[PDB]
Design a protein around this ligand. Structure first.
Ligand SMILES: Cn1ccnc1C(=O)c1ccc(NC(=O)C[C@H](C(=O)O)c2ccc(C(F)(F)F)cc2)cc1
Lengths: 329, 330, 328, 329
């Protein structure tokens, strides 16, 4: 007498190597999850949240699509033991930006949540890289770094990877070029104080501000400054229209995860400690271009900013530090 | 202007899109289809259409902001169906969706009404497209789309039991310790409560599970494999109870079908089509049988061998669906 | 200051998904390009003994790095470059000439393996060995005996390709993509391979049940000719272009995908089948195996008809007759 | 009833014209590398191969067909008759004499012009609406020749040009900087050959001009000898050919990169061979590489790269060299 399985299969053999955990199964977390699944970045995906039904429903929905994926193990749970041995833990949990609301208003509430999340993550994946997505992402990357005790190369904020992607899309819409071939960087706060690096914007290595010196100024008859205003307002407008943002940030996060998981050493504008650059003296985290790989941030790229750009980046650091210094944890 | 100093134009002749896909409906199902199609590089232009103008624009913008990470260079939206012109494939997901405990068949009046306005507008602007119906009850709405469009039935395809079969193969794989890709088994009939598990065709590596386990699919089964089908039937209800709706699996299922159509693969999928003439069925009933899918839609039907009980269940599903289809007026 | 140090502030002074391909002949390079375009490795190492071809192939792949997502492509004539591999793919050795049987390669390629396998194993002691060189079933046995690895980690590419060819030919006959044409070729990757007619199906419909004479000498449709074309495929391609490469490279990348991504998909690969069908010796040939990050985790016990089982035992006798004459 | 007829009920009796058909002309090493790269990127729903060596053509076709289970291109065909190429959207020409050890690409010009007099009219006859992608060498001159013979508008006659040279440049840049080539930006323009031009003034990482940081970059006084990078670009093909007998993989991937931009209408910027009359002081009908926007109509636009006087003179010299050959045909 033998069961079906035992008549069909002779068992020979009785840890995951490319495991990714997503913390938070709100819209941002689930868009990160689906993007990472469709890019075949992980051999195991773990989801963690505190709403048990929603967590199970999202896990089941993904699992029902397994035939169409190449990620063979999808698990979930409220207990962080399900996250054990992750290479990469993506934290998207916490309060999310609402209509008309500054991401900076979320800071203390999400700091309080990180006091619980981060130690549990570190307990079960002491060797992982942390990719912070929750907002305000720059301050929460600082907080995650402080709580975790990790070296700062392994604490990465998704930062302005998305703002720069939005900038390159809008740039491409004006020039009739795919964003892949429109190069431009948004640095600083992932938020209202972000900094467009007009002096570096280029197609095929041609500096656009060299052709158009008014680029980025008020006197600009083409009003390129509106491009950056649209970058700043983008999240507010999408939130007002559909209630939240999800797809673009999910793709941005999966882009960062690809560079990390595959050790690509591509350059991304992500949140990291900038103390000692551009005359900044405090432990401020904000986005500068960094080399990203399997050890996290291995190097910073020292971008040459104009005086006007450097002043705006300092203003961004001052805004963040004004909030950072008043946190207790 | 800066653009003219930077760029020398050779020609400004904009041509018709070559691989355009439209998604009608920007609810959770429609957006899951859209992101799945975008990340599989199946379209060179994606159009979104719906009646909720704010949500439509917000979803469009959110996808557009991810363009750097995609290889689909044009993403458009509008309430006017002129944005959908010259689509190769139009995926209809709009309509009411089932609440907790609610049958897909309770959606008929609401979504037939919506289709009576959607389909003529789609056909007006993409007269050569394939219609991929996802809205529920999908088998009845595929019938409806066929009647209203006037298209040949090869170009009217219901997403049908592609998802039920995927779920079945997932649950098979969990029981056997095998990836669903290597677990073969078909759920046919209604995408709903009357679906039919084809026990006689379930296999791994060409080994019939029913041959090894003759009680498979019966009440005397000490392993209770019928509970696997029951889980398939209940899957959407359980997910809806937990997260309020389903989206990711159906989106991946639809992108799977769209891949076969857009790349002319001639893969076999269980999709909603007219099965008149099969198993001595004489009415124009639409339900899922395995179909060869390619760039012209359904090119062939596979004549699955069914046991007596399997065929009786399929006829019961056909009777349930036809009981509803026959009372529809066009 | 150097340009690099002016541009880059450094913060930080082993590969996690490394694949090595041994042999940079046409088969090895087809495996390499297929693996690279499937993004299966974060480091790819090429090893061979022909210094010039090796460096030339390495440089050619590197020059395409902008279009790939594998950031480290290395090569060498020594094993330093292979250290810490998850998967080592062995394609080196003599290949069959026009009209030459794969079994005629035994002496030459067994000799090569007695040098390659002991060294490979020293520097990647945890890798899976994927044998592609021919005769692959005999050489998988050799690699297992020599390496000291447990058998789950010594895998021959086997009949994965014969089955792919069978399903392609099936699909041409039936008007269906090979992905939807299901049928297995087992046994020797060679002239004694066994088509499992009794399992061939589309959408779970048994073709033999529809056509009980399928694949016999009574078959009016002559489906046996489909398997004959499978057996003869490599000979015909070698006669026409001199060698085969693309199909075997894609077949191997398919196996590497299942291993590297821990998919637990079923593939017909060369493994030890002692205990199946009453076979008593350490014969290696292809049966369907579940493939993942530990290599072969399970064997599928295919239900064979009397004639299919008899043909499989004939294949086993041919291989065993050669296997048992080898000394270690 | 036969087995097929017991199993399958045909609804459609015939197949429609292919919608995304690509033809590769020539099945030497370069042609087959293009074919496999295009197949593994899912760019075509039909691939046709043409050449004059009947046995090798059929063997290559069969070998690709035998891997069809692992691909998503359902029709692979071949023939000596160009009717097999009918209705291609893109025809890639790799046929003719290929560069040998020690051999200048320019030595191949007259032989390959002779071959194109037969190939191009046959291609045009069966695919009057295709784009032509010239890979055969010397690619710049043969792009000019294919344009004149075909009668096509120049937007539909594209030379693979310096897309590969630039990829090699960026690879070597990345090796020097420890950055993935995706994040190293730099253009090699002009002849796909010995007279190519490195645009030092445009090289950048994250929009930081390397020449601005390192003003000696590319000159003879350069203590870091970055000019050796371009020398390596120039010599790369010679070295690879000397080592393995030919080049194939990198050009195959480069062509598949161009084919992707064309087939998917991406409007990405690539340095490809086109007419540059009206730029940089060039008044002749010379074809050479400059950055072009590539899409479903082929080359729709050129990017007017800003050059130093020394870069511009080098590009004019490359143009003079090519024109001296072009005009003697
Ligand atoms: C002389 N004669 C007269 C009449 N019949 C005979 C035979 O000898 C004979 C002997 C055997 C068969 N067929 C099978 O063994 C099919 C096999 C099974 O049934 O296990 C099966 C494999 C795979 C699948 C699935 F699910 F994968 F598709 C389903 C079923 C047919 C005729």
């Amino acid at each position: 007498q033998a069961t079906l399985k035992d008549q069909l299969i002779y068992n020979l053999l009785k840890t995951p190597q490319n495991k990714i955990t997503v913390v938070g199964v709100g819209a941002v977390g689930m868009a990160c999850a689906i993007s990472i699944l469709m890019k075949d970045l992980a051999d195991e995906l773990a989801l963690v949240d505190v709403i048990e039904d929603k967590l199970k429903g999202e896990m089941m929905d993904l699992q029902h699509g397994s035939l169409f994926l190449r990620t063979p193990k999808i698990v979930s749970g409220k207990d962080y033991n399900v996250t054990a041995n992750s290479k990469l833990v993506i934290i998207t949990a916490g309060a999310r930006q609402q209509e008309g609301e500054s991401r900076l208003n979320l800071v203390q509430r999400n700091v309080n949540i990180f006091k619980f999340i981060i130690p549990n993550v570190v307990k079960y994946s002491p060797n992982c890289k942390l990719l912070i997505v929750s907002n305000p992402v720059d301050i929460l990357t600082y907080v995650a770094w402080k709580i975790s005790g990790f070296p700062k190369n392994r604490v990465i904020g998704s930062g302005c990877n998305l703002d720069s992607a939005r900038f390159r899309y809008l740039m491409g819409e004006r020039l009739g070029v795919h964003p892949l071939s429109c190069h431009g960087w948004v640095l600083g706060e992932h938020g209202d104080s972000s900094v467009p690096v007009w002096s570096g914007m280029n197609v095929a290595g041609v500096s656009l501000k060299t052709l158009h010196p008014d680029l980025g100024t008020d006197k600009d008859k083409e009003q390129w400054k509106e491009v950056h205003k649209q970058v700043v307002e983008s999240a507010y407008e999408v939130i007002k229209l559909k209630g939240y943002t999800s797809w673009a940030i999910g793709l941005s996060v999966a882009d960062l995860a690809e560079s990390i998981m595959k050790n690509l050493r591509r350059v991304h504008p992500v949140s990291t400690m900038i103390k000692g650059l551009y005359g900044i003296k405090d432990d401020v985290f904000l986005s500068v271009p960094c080399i990203l790989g399997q050890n996290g941030i291995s190097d910073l790229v020292k971008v040459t900013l104009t005086s006007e750009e450097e002043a705006r980046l300092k203003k961004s650091a001052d805004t963040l530090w004004g909030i950072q210094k008043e946190l207790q944890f």
